[PDB]
Design an enzyme around this catalytic site. Structure first.
Site, PDB file in Angstrom:
ATOM      1  N   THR A 159       4.986  56.645  26.143  1.00 43.29           N
ATOM      2  CA  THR A 159       5.955  55.566  25.465  1.00 43.29           C
ATOM      3  C   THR A 159       7.226  55.483  26.369  1.00 43.29           C
ATOM      4  N   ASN A 180       8.004  61.125  29.249  1.00 44.69           N
ATOM      5  CA  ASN A 180       8.975  61.656  27.915  1.00 44.69           C
ATOM      6  C   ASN A 180      10.157  63.112  27.761  1.00 44.69           C
ATOM      7  N   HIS A 265      -3.195  59.002  17.647  1.00 45.39           N
ATOM      8  CA  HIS A 265      -3.184  60.530  18.409  1.00 45.39           C
ATOM      9  C   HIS A 265      -3.943  60.896  17.153  1.00 45.39           C
ATOM     10  N   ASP A 687       9.126  56.586  49.524  1.00 44.12           N
ATOM     11  CA  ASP A 687      10.501  55.291  49.017  1.00 44.12           C
ATOM     12  C   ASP A 687       9.456  54.232  48.428  1.00 44.12           C
TER      13      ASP A 687
HETATM   14  C1  LIG Z   1      11.841  48.729  42.623  1.00 44.17           C
HETATM   15  O1  LIG Z   1      12.930  48.143  42.829  1.00 44.17           O
HETATM   16  C2  LIG Z   1      14.266  48.578  42.881  1.00 44.17           C
HETATM   17  C3  LIG Z   1      15.706  47.951  42.807  1.00 44.17           C
HETATM   18  O2  LIG Z   1      15.874  46.959  43.384  1.00 44.17           O
HETATM   19  C4  LIG Z   1      14.344  48.867  44.301  1.00 44.17           C
HETATM   20  O3  LIG Z   1      15.434  50.434  44.353  1.00 44.17           O
HETATM   21  C5  LIG Z   1      16.720  49.699  45.187  1.00 44.17           C
HETATM   22  O4  LIG Z   1      16.229  50.117  46.579  1.00 44.17           O
HETATM   23  C6  LIG Z   1      17.824  50.139  47.549  1.00 44.17           C
HETATM   24  C7  LIG Z   1      16.909  51.156  48.754  1.00 44.17           C
HETATM   25  O5  LIG Z   1      16.425  52.521  47.695  1.00 44.17           O
HETATM   26  C8  LIG Z   1      18.391  51.503  46.289  1.00 44.17           C
HETATM   27  O6  LIG Z   1      19.912  50.914  47.208  1.00 44.17           O
HETATM   28  C9  LIG Z   1      21.279  51.754  47.330  1.00 44.17           C
HETATM   29  O7  LIG Z   1      21.628  51.554  46.610  1.00 44.17           O
HETATM   30  C10 LIG Z   1      23.118  52.948  46.779  1.00 44.17           C
HETATM   31  C11 LIG Z   1      23.448  52.785  46.278  1.00 44.17           C
HETATM   32  O8  LIG Z   1      23.715  53.316  44.451  1.00 44.17           O
HETATM   33  C12 LIG Z   1      23.674  52.622  43.011  1.00 44.17           C
HETATM   34  O9  LIG Z   1      23.797  51.939  42.707  1.00 44.17           O
HETATM   35  C13 LIG Z   1      23.016  50.293  42.175  1.00 44.17           C
HETATM   36  C14 LIG Z   1      23.218  48.759  42.010  1.00 44.17           C
HETATM   37  O10 LIG Z   1      24.211  49.498  40.987  1.00 44.17           O
HETATM   38  C15 LIG Z   1      22.273  51.427  41.436  1.00 44.17           C
HETATM   39  O11 LIG Z   1      21.420  50.694  41.078  1.00 44.17           O
HETATM   40  C16 LIG Z   1      21.848  52.833  41.686  1.00 44.17           C
HETATM   41  O12 LIG Z   1      20.931  53.719  40.914  1.00 44.17           O
HETATM   42  C17 LIG Z   1      20.291  54.631  41.311  1.00 44.17           C
HETATM   43  O13 LIG Z   1      21.395  55.795  41.327  1.00 44.17           O
HETATM   44  C18 LIG Z   1      21.095  56.258  39.743  1.00 44.17           C
HETATM   45  C19 LIG Z   1      21.568  58.061  40.114  1.00 44.17           C
HETATM   46  O14 LIG Z   1      22.974  57.332  40.540  1.00 44.17           O
HETATM   47  C20 LIG Z   1      19.812  55.999  38.776  1.00 44.17           C
HETATM   48  O15 LIG Z   1      20.416  56.481  37.172  1.00 44.17           O
HETATM   49  C21 LIG Z   1      18.742  55.484  39.005  1.00 44.17           C
HETATM   50  O16 LIG Z   1      18.085  55.693  37.971  1.00 44.17           O
HETATM   51  C22 LIG Z   1      18.665  54.638  40.609  1.00 44.17           C
HETATM   52  O17 LIG Z   1      17.319  56.364  41.243  1.00 44.17           O
HETATM   53  C23 LIG Z   1      16.918  55.165  41.655  1.00 44.17           C
HETATM   54  O18 LIG Z   1      17.204  55.087  43.003  1.00 44.17           O
HETATM   55  C24 LIG Z   1      18.340  56.090  44.238  1.00 44.17           C
HETATM   56  C25 LIG Z   1      18.277  55.456  45.553  1.00 44.17           C
HETATM   57  O19 LIG Z   1      19.539  54.681  44.964  1.00 44.17           O
HETATM   58  C26 LIG Z   1      16.967  57.247  43.729  1.00 44.17           C
HETATM   59  O20 LIG Z   1      17.802  58.029  45.086  1.00 44.17           O
HETATM   60  C27 LIG Z   1      16.052  57.630  42.603  1.00 44.17           C
HETATM   61  O21 LIG Z   1      15.314  58.488  42.658  1.00 44.17           O
HETATM   62  C28 LIG Z   1      15.363  56.367  41.665  1.00 44.17           C
HETATM   63  O22 LIG Z   1      14.887  55.772  42.760  1.00 44.17           O
HETATM   64  C29 LIG Z   1      22.547  53.948  42.107  1.00 44.17           C
HETATM   65  O23 LIG Z   1      24.057  54.387  41.391  1.00 44.17           O
HETATM   66  C30 LIG Z   1      23.504  52.681  48.262  1.00 44.17           C
HETATM   67  O24 LIG Z   1      24.072  54.134  48.456  1.00 44.17           O
HETATM   68  C31 LIG Z   1      22.465  52.812  49.538  1.00 44.17           C
HETATM   69  O25 LIG Z   1      22.770  52.900  50.806  1.00 44.17           O
HETATM   70  C32 LIG Z   1      22.662  54.027  51.647  1.00 44.17           C
HETATM   71  O26 LIG Z   1      21.198  53.295  52.527  1.00 44.17           O
HETATM   72  C33 LIG Z   1      21.891  52.209  53.555  1.00 44.17           C
HETATM   73  C34 LIG Z   1      20.698  51.741  54.095  1.00 44.17           C
HETATM   74  O27 LIG Z   1      20.915  49.608  54.008  1.00 44.17           O
HETATM   75  C35 LIG Z   1      23.058  52.375  54.459  1.00 44.17           C
HETATM   76  O28 LIG Z   1      23.244  51.900  55.064  1.00 44.17           O
HETATM   77  C36 LIG Z   1      23.997  53.277  53.784  1.00 44.17           C
HETATM   78  O29 LIG Z   1      24.711  53.633  54.461  1.00 44.17           O
HETATM   79  C37 LIG Z   1      23.874  54.032  52.950  1.00 44.17           C
HETATM   80  O30 LIG Z   1      23.661  55.617  53.571  1.00 44.17           O
HETATM   81  C38 LIG Z   1      24.344  56.279  52.737  1.00 44.17           C
HETATM   82  O31 LIG Z   1      23.779  57.800  51.669  1.00 44.17           O
HETATM   83  C39 LIG Z   1      23.131  58.018  52.203  1.00 44.17           C
HETATM   84  C40 LIG Z   1      22.313  58.206  50.377  1.00 44.17           C
HETATM   85  O32 LIG Z   1      23.410  59.647  50.395  1.00 44.17           O
HETATM   86  C41 LIG Z   1      23.325  59.323  53.297  1.00 44.17           C
HETATM   87  O33 LIG Z   1      22.177  59.857  54.149  1.00 44.17           O
HETATM   88  C42 LIG Z   1      23.779  58.378  54.948  1.00 44.17           C
HETATM   89  O34 LIG Z   1      23.650  59.369  55.738  1.00 44.17           O
HETATM   90  C43 LIG Z   1      24.889  57.285  54.036  1.00 44.17           C
HETATM   91  O35 LIG Z   1      26.257  58.127  53.938  1.00 44.17           O
HETATM   92  C44 LIG Z   1      21.289  52.098  49.175  1.00 44.17           C
HETATM   93  O36 LIG Z   1      21.903  50.136  49.735  1.00 44.17           O
HETATM   94  C45 LIG Z   1      19.225  50.943  44.967  1.00 44.17           C
HETATM   95  O37 LIG Z   1      20.428  51.177  44.941  1.00 44.17           O
HETATM   96  C46 LIG Z   1      17.357  50.848  44.489  1.00 44.17           C
HETATM   97  N1  LIG Z   1      17.652  50.745  42.589  1.00 44.17           N
HETATM   98  C47 LIG Z   1      17.493  51.383  41.506  1.00 44.17           C
HETATM   99  C48 LIG Z   1      17.612  50.417  40.944  1.00 44.17           C
HETATM  100  O38 LIG Z   1      16.918  52.200  42.278  1.00 44.17           O
HETATM  101  C49 LIG Z   1      13.415  50.163  44.699  1.00 44.17           C
HETATM  102  O39 LIG Z   1      13.230  50.394  46.312  1.00 44.17           O
HETATM  103  C50 LIG Z   1      11.873  49.039  44.363  1.00 44.17           C
HETATM  104  N2  LIG Z   1      10.590  49.237  45.086  1.00 44.17           N
HETATM  105  C51 LIG Z   1       9.806  49.256  46.202  1.00 44.17           C
HETATM  106  C52 LIG Z   1       8.379  50.337  45.753  1.00 44.17           C
HETATM  107  O40 LIG Z   1      10.031  48.421  46.479  1.00 44.17           O
HETATM  108  C1  LIG Z   2      12.344  53.885  25.542  1.00 47.53           C
HETATM  109  C2  LIG Z   2      13.177  52.839  25.218  1.00 47.53           C
HETATM  110  N1  LIG Z   2      13.563  52.288  26.532  1.00 47.53           N
HETATM  111  N2  LIG Z   2      13.833  51.178  25.896  1.00 47.53           N
HETATM  112  N3  LIG Z   2      13.693  50.592  24.813  1.00 47.53           N
HETATM  113  C3  LIG Z   2      13.991  49.884  23.895  1.00 47.53           C
HETATM  114  C4  LIG Z   2      12.889  49.311  23.836  1.00 47.53           C
HETATM  115  C5  LIG Z   2      12.889  48.028  24.358  1.00 47.53           C
HETATM  116  C6  LIG Z   2      11.511  46.928  24.131  1.00 47.53           C
HETATM  117  C7  LIG Z   2      11.297  45.810  25.504  1.00 47.53           C
HETATM  118  F1  LIG Z   2      11.569  45.130  24.933  1.00 47.53           F
HETATM  119  F2  LIG Z   2      11.686  46.412  26.558  1.00 47.53           F
HETATM  120  F3  LIG Z   2       9.504  45.885  25.152  1.00 47.53           F
HETATM  121  C8  LIG Z   2      10.997  46.835  22.835  1.00 47.53           C
HETATM  122  C9  LIG Z   2      11.221  48.036  21.891  1.00 47.53           C
HETATM  123  C10 LIG Z   2      12.317  48.918  21.945  1.00 47.53           C
HETATM  124  C11 LIG Z   2      12.734  49.931  20.829  1.00 47.53           C
HETATM  125  C12 LIG Z   2      12.224  51.203  21.083  1.00 47.53           C
HETATM  126  C13 LIG Z   2      13.304  51.941  20.027  1.00 47.53           C
HETATM  127  O1  LIG Z   2      13.656  51.797  19.129  1.00 47.53           O
HETATM  128  N4  LIG Z   2      12.154  53.080  19.971  1.00 47.53           N
HETATM  129  C14 LIG Z   2      10.945  53.642  20.504  1.00 47.53           C
HETATM  130  C15 LIG Z   2      12.322  54.122  19.058  1.00 47.53           C
HETATM  131  C16 LIG Z   2      13.801  54.861  18.357  1.00 47.53           C
HETATM  132  O2  LIG Z   2      14.098  55.195  20.450  1.00 47.53           O
HETATM  133  C17 LIG Z   2      15.484  55.296  20.739  1.00 47.53           C
HETATM  134  C18 LIG Z   2      15.173  55.436  22.275  1.00 47.53           C
HETATM  135  C19 LIG Z   2      16.383  56.221  22.853  1.00 47.53           C
HETATM  136  C20 LIG Z   2      17.598  56.157  22.096  1.00 47.53           C
HETATM  137  S1  LIG Z   2      19.277  56.150  23.221  1.00 47.53           S
HETATM  138  N5  LIG Z   2      18.673  55.939  24.230  1.00 47.53           N
HETATM  139  O3  LIG Z   2      19.779  56.376  22.103  1.00 47.53           O
HETATM  140  O4  LIG Z   2      18.554  58.281  24.056  1.00 47.53           O
HETATM  141  C21 LIG Z   2      17.600  56.010  21.189  1.00 47.53           C
HETATM  142  C22 LIG Z   2      16.444  56.218  20.515  1.00 47.53           C
HETATM  143  N6  LIG Z   2      13.383  51.706  24.624  1.00 47.53           N
END
Ligand SMILES: *[C@@H]1O[C@H](CO)[C@@H](O[C@@H]2O[C@H](CO)[C@@H](O[C@@H]3O[C@H](CO[C@H]4O[C@H](CO)[C@@H](O)[C@H](O[C@H]5O[C@H](CO)[C@@H](O)[C@H](O)[C@@H]5O[C@H]5O[C@H](CO)[C@@H](O)[C@H](O)[C@@H]5O)[C@@H]4O)[C@@H](O)[C@H](O[C@H]4O[C@H](CO)[C@@H](O)[C@H](O)[C@@H]4O[C@H]4O[C@H](CO)[C@@H](O)[C@H](O)[C@@H]4O)[C@@H]3O)[C@H](O)[C@H]2NC(C)=O)[C@H](O)[C@H]1NC(C)=O
Ligand SMILES: Cc1nnn(Cc2cc(C(F)(F)F)ccc2CCC(=O)N(C)CCOc2ccc(S(N)(=O)=O)cc2)n1
Ligand SMILES: [Ca+2]
Ligand SMILES: [Ca+2]
Ligand SMILES: [K+]
Ligand code: NA
Ligand SMILES: [Zn+2]
Length: 805
Positions: A159, A180, A265, A687
């Site tokens: 979910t 989950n 379930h 990746d």
């Molecule tokens: C699916 O779609 C998504 C979205 O488009 C694709 O993911 C993107 O891919 C890009 C490449 O992997 C990636 O770009 C990087 O961004 C870094 C900055 O990231 C932060 O800011 C963004 C924007 O707000 C944010 O979205 C990020 O969110 C991630 O991290 C947080 C945790 O802080 C999580 O809450 C979140 O879920 C998300 O995690 C996921 O992505 C990260 C990677 O960012 C993974 O590690 C996780 O496992 C998870 O999958 C961030 O908060 C930026 O810093 C990177 O830059 C490095 O690389 C470039 C290459 O151009 C290089 O030139 C730079 O020098 C730099 O390197 C330096 O750092 C390195 C590592 O520390 C180090 O080794 C070097 O030596 C250097 O110091 C990079 O540009 C983008 O962030 C993600 N976005 C998301 C949302 O995931 C995904 O690829 C698609 N999938 C497919 C299969 O197509």
């Molecule tokens: C997971 C998830 N991811 N996105 N949503 C919202 C959502 C999306 C979509 C989408 F349009 F995408 F189809 C439709 C409906 C929802 C609402 C789901 C919902 O109401 N549920 C599952 C009961 C309470 O669930 C909570 C979960 C976390 C917190 S939290 N973040 O405060 O810890 C609170 C309540 N749920």
């Protein structure tokens, strides 16, 4: 701490969350134990129930009632949803004939058609047909609007990962909600369905639709609903928000139902107890639609009816126990159920070894109902590896089964008859999609599609720019009447070199040999023409792939195949060839068994060498264009060029050779010819994205020849199979794979048998979208067809699943 002393007077289901310690009146206040003292009294009224009756019509307003039937209720926005039916002679929405909604018919002051997402937990795809007789409102949405026969969830089919994927367009590995239940080793923190840690924003990545909206000036309803808020009250709340002044009224809303999952379930997906939950959901849809009709919004709002995942028959007795395989079961932590995730119980235990755990779980029992993987070896289509919250060891569980650590876990927790979580291609896991409204099409069926695509469409529906996501924007344009997104193909970054004959044979010192010294103006001109591209139209049917990154590569033409040869990786990026229905398979002749020939168009310095393969006792080689499918004995010599060779473990050569010798011809026979594009993939950091040169972890021993992690093929033919693949006038048909390049066949428990008993099963497991290959290669396919670009985008997202109907 909460100061529950404040009041919810004039604040019921307020949209802006107030901060602690002040008390809350929003739709999640119950979940945080923070509602003001009078929230139930004021905001959860139940008096007189949810339906007007004839005796209530035109009543004197009593503010205590759950909903109203007084004359003033329409202006107040708080009538019971059946008010106009009961009191003003109107029909229920469900009883009205459908009439096409060609344009939005919205009240004055509406800036855009609102979007209402009606989400249903555990709504298995087949419920739309199997339950149609007890779901008349849903069936009207489905038949009159735009529907898919099913929508594919993300893995794991749980979910929280699926709802957050719907909201963000992201794979779970990217958004971070990978189950989950989760442990984050960096945070040293655990996420559970129950409890308060999940409220921490650090778990939730990407940008969900409600944030995308708000950041761009479009107001959103709160999507989440505490479980104790009855469904009737959720619908009334939405309808009351829709009666807000223009400057205060949201444009996007969600409803959520915990049904039919909750009962599923307990009772199994088709338990006789499931009819009533389906009826109740349909009733709720009817309340919404009647309510919208009262507000004159039923031909204005776009409604999405969508589920998160399906439901399978699963009972306690179908449980595999790791205690029957592992000596050391107390040394591991298992996340159990319909998937397994294993890590060490203690990071201080230096005797913990994943290789020994994997081996102890591999093909040990003849009917074994799970399969262990290191996460990087999981089918690429799952996109389930690139997150530190995903444990290295994964167990893929067969549908209908569970895995657990020990038996006491299963009787110290039988009860349940349904579960979900399995591989997202499993038919029981599929869920639903219907879109109804002015922006969706009328009476239109669309093919199945993945839930990762919907975020882009929801953005389209609201006039929002989507945040970066894993959808392919445009691939769902065929669902929409208007608001389509019209992308342009990406620009080619690297242009190819077209080398001619530039090297003599004696310049090569590759340690290769070939018995090819046997020799005409008629035919010599003709073979020079083949090397200049004279057959290229036959073998490159959809144009050359475009290279979307900076590199150095050569186009090489041949009688039977064309390739794009990388000077950096010393092998093709892609090799393209067409096999007609009439093509004949032949052998590798005796005298050519070990033949490898220098390619006089490509320098010795940018070539592989045979000596490295001789010296690497673990690594052999194969060919991208199969010598078995040569058009003539003379053309076959081209297939042994060093520029067609790729590194292959012997265990993998078993798979590859059977694909090439048997299966390609089989598909050409079945599909009326096929076009094949094959190549290597390098994804050492798992990746899902093309590795750069400096990410490569393994080379053929003593050389600069990189070893692929995977091998792909894209197999295209005419959707109308009465036309041959090379003379197709209309839509295309595709299937593709990304096979793991592994040094053993431990994945395939029957691999001691003939390849006819196991190779095709392996390949089906590793089925892929063209788009998955695009990400992994930096290539862009289907650049030159006669088809609409959006049509091609749909084709690139297709997944051939191999399941029946
Ligand atoms: C699916 O779609 C998504 C979205 O488009 C694709 O993911 C993107 O891919 C890009 C490449 O992997 C990636 O770009 C990087 O961004 C870094 C900055 O990231 C932060 O800011 C963004 C924007 O707000 C944010 O979205 C990020 O969110 C991630 O991290 C947080 C945790 O802080 C999580 O809450 C979140 O879920 C998300 O995690 C996921 O992505 C990260 C990677 O960012 C993974 O590690 C996780 O496992 C998870 O999958 C961030 O908060 C930026 O810093 C990177 O830059 C490095 O690389 C470039 C290459 O151009 C290089 O030139 C730079 O020098 C730099 O390197 C330096 O750092 C390195 C590592 O520390 C180090 O080794 C070097 O030596 C250097 O110091 C990079 O540009 C983008 O962030 C993600 N976005 C998301 C949302 O995931 C995904 O690829 C698609 N999938 C497919 C299969 O197509
Ligand atoms: C997971 C998830 N991811 N996105 N949503 C919202 C959502 C999306 C979509 C989408 F349009 F995408 F189809 C439709 C409906 C929802 C609402 C789901 C919902 O109401 N549920 C599952 C009961 C309470 O669930 C909570 C979960 C976390 C917190 S939290 N973040 O405060 O810890 C609170 C309540 N749920
Ligand atoms: Ca669910
Ligand atoms: Ca990579
Ligand atoms: K070798
Ligand atoms: Na095996
Ligand atoms: Zn469930």
């Amino acid at each position: 701490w909460t100061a529950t002393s404040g009041s919810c007077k004039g604040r019921c289901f307020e949209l802006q969350e107030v901060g602690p310690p002040d008390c809350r009146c929003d739709n999640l206040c119950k979940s945080y134990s923070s509602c003001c003292h009078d929230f139930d009294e004021l905001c959860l009224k139940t008096a007189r129930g949810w339906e007007c009756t004839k005796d209530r019509c035109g009543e004197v307003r009593n503010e205590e009632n759950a909903c109203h039937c007084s004359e003033d209720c329409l202006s107040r926005g708080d009538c019971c949803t059946n008010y106009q039916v009961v009191c003003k002679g109107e029909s229920h929405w469900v009883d009205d004939d459908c009439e096409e909604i060609k344009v939005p018919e919205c009240p004055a002051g509406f800036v855009r058609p609102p979007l209402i997402i009606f989400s249903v937990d555990g709504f298995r795809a087949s419920y739309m047909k199997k339950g149609s007789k007890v779901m008349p409102n849903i069936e009207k949405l489905r038949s009159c609007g735009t529907h898919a026969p099913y929508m594919r969830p993300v893995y794991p089919t749980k979910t929280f990962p699926n709802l957050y994927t719907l909201a963000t367009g992201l794979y779970p590995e990217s958004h971070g909600i990978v189950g989950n239940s989760m442990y984050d080793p960096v945070f040293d923190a655990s996420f559970h369905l129950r409890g308060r840690e999940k409220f921490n924003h650090r778990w939730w990545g990407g940008q969900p639709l409600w944030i995308t909206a708000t950041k761009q000036g479009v107001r959103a309803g709160t999507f989440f609903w505490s479980v104790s808020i009855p469904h009737e009250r959720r619908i009334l709340t939405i309808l009351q928000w829709l009666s807000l002044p223009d400057n205060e009224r949201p444009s996007v809303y969600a409803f959520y139902s915990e049904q039919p999952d909750f009962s599923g379930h307990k009772y199994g997906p088709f338990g006789p107890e499931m009819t009533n939950p389906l009826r109740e959901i349909d009733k709720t849809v009817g309340q919404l639609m009647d309510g919208l009709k009262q507000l004159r919004l039923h031909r204005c709002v776009n409604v999405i009816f969508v589920g998160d995942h399906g439901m399978e028959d699963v009972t306690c007795d179908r449980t595999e126990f790791l205690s029957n395989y592992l000596t050391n079961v107390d040394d591991i932590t298992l996340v159990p159920g319909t998937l397994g995730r294993i890590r060490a119980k203690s990071i201080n235990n230096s005797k913990y070894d994943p290789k020994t755990i994997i081996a102890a779980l591999t093909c040990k029992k003849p009917d074994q109902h799970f399969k262990p993987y290191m996460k990087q070896h999981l089918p690429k289509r799952l996109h389930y590896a690139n997150n530190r919250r995903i444990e290295d060891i994964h167990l893929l569980v067969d549908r209908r089964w569970h895995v657990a650590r020990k038996p006491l876990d299963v009787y110290k927790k039988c009860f349940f008859q349904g579960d979900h979580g399995f591989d997202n291609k499993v038919n029981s896991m599929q869920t639903v999609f219907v879109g109804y409204g002015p922006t969706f099409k009328y009476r239109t069926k669309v093919p199945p599609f993945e839930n990762i695509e919907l975020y882009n469409v929801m953005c389209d529906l609201l006039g929002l720019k989507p945040a970066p996501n894993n959808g392919t924007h445009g691939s769902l344009n065929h669902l929409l009447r208007t608001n389509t997104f019209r992308p342009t193909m990406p620009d080619e970054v690297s242009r190819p070199n077209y080398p001619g004959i530039m090297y003599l044979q004696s310049e090569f010192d590759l340690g290769c040999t070939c018995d090819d010294k046997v020799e005409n103006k008629l035919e010599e001109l003709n073979k020079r023409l083949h090397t200049k591209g004279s057959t290229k139209e036959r073998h490159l049917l959809y144009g050359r792939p475009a290279v979307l990154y900076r590199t150095s590569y050569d186009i090489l033409y041949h009688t039977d195949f064309e390739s794009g040869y990388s000077e950096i990786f010393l092998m093709p990026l892609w090799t393209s060839y067409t096999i007609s229905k009439q093509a004949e398979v032949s052998s590798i002749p005796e005298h050519l068994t070990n033949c490898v020939r220098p390619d006089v168009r490509v320098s010795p310095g940018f070539s592989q060498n045979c000596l490295a393969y001789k010296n690497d006792k673990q690594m052999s080689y194969g060919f991208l264009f199969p010598p078995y499918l040569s058009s003539s004995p003379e053309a076959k010599y081209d297939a042994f060029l060093v520029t067609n060779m790729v590194p292959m473990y012997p265990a993998f050569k078993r798979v590859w050779a059977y694909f090439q010798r048997v299966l390609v011809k089989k598909y050409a026979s079945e599909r009326n010819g096929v076009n094949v594009i094959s190549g290597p993939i390098f994804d050492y950091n798992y990746d899902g994205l093309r590795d750069t040169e400096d990410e490569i972890k393994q080379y053929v021993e003593g050389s600069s020849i990189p070893v692929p992690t995977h091998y792909y093929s894209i197999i295209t033919s005419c959707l109308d199979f009465t036309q041959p693949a090379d003379k197709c006038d209309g839509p295309l048909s595709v299937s593709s794979f990304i096979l793991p390049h592994r040094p053993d066949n431990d994945e395939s428990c029957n691999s001691s048998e003939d390849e006819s008993k196991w190779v095709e099963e392996l390949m089906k497991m590793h089925t892929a979208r063209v788009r998955d290959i695009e990400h992994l290669t930096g290539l862009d396919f289907y650049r030159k067809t006669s088809r609409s670009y959006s049509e091609i985008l749909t084709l690139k997202t297709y997944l051939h699943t191999y399941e029946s109907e």
